[PDB]
Design a protein around this ligand. Structure first.
Ligand SMILES: C[C@H](CS)C(=O)Nc1cccc(-c2nn[nH]n2)c1
Ligand SMILES: [Zn+2]
Ligand SMILES: [Zn+2]
Length: 231
């Protein structure tokens, strides 16, 4: 079964096989007095692994690398962070120290700088305007426009029809807004339709926090954002 928050002590990471050569990584971390689960992606890139997002902190991210080595045994050589928050860049310094080349859009890297979070080393060019998409090894990176954050990217794995929505996408059982401190509640439903229009063939949809689902997560997320807009 997909691991839930009460099953993962903070400091431990679980790996979950989604398809051949595609895994999600699941960690847990405290935020303002409660502990939450968090998802990331791992994609086989030939003889190497491409990591999508840290495990939300340095200690969790070290546990992630240890779990990858134990269970998969290929090197993580590249990583992309999908937004500037700590569940996506927190641990980038651990990755860099372990030899991982770290990437994020230029908007993400500057927003990370400002918030005092860790900063990916390399900039992803070609994602500066909503609707833009670029190839990055075995994945496509898509900028859907502002949503959970103004700099949020989603990640598509064509080999497997896996759509990684990151924190722009809510899981089914979440019916209220999470951290919207940095969100653009007006644009958000528009960006979701863009995702829907760019990846209608998506088979698995992974939110930034919680249980994977289908393209139904897109509709559901839009409802939650709008419910919260006239609450
Ligand atoms: C740092 C990380 C960036 S998305 C984060 O805020 N995760 C996160 C995840 C799930 C819920 C909440 C939340 N906030 N208020 N009620 N629930 C926050
Ligand atoms: Zn976030
Ligand atoms: Zn998040």
């Amino acid at each position: 079964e997909y691991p839930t928050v009460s099953e993962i002590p903070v400091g431990e990471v679980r790996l979950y096989q989604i398809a051949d050569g595609v895994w999600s990584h699941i960690a847990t971390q405290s935020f303002d007095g409660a502990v939450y689960p968090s998802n990331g992606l791992i994609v086989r890139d030939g003889d190497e692994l491409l990591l999508i997002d840290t495990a939300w902190g340095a200690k969790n991210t070290a546990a992630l690398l240890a779990e990858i080595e134990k269970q998969i045994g290929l090197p993580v050589t590249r990583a992309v962070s999908t937004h500037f928050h700590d569940d996506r860049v927190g641990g980038v310094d651990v990755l860099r120290a372990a030899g991982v080349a770290t990437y994020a859009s230029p908007s993400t890297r500057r927003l990370a700088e400002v918030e005092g979070n860790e900063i990916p080393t390399h900039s992803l060019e070609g994602l500066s305007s909503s609707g833009d998409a670029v190839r990055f090894g075995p994945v496509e990176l898509f900028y859907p426009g502002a949503a959970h954050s103004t700099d949020n990217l989603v990640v598509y794995v064509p080999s497997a029809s896996v759509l990684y929505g990151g924190c722009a996408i809510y899981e089914l059982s979440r019916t209220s807004a999470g951290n919207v401190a940095d969100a653009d509640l007006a644009e958000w439903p528009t960006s979701i339709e863009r995702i829907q229009q760019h990846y209608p063939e998506a088979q698995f949809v992974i939110p930034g926090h919680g249980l994977p689902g289908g393209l139904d997560l897109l509709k559901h997320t839009t409802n939650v954002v709008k419910a919260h807009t006239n609450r």
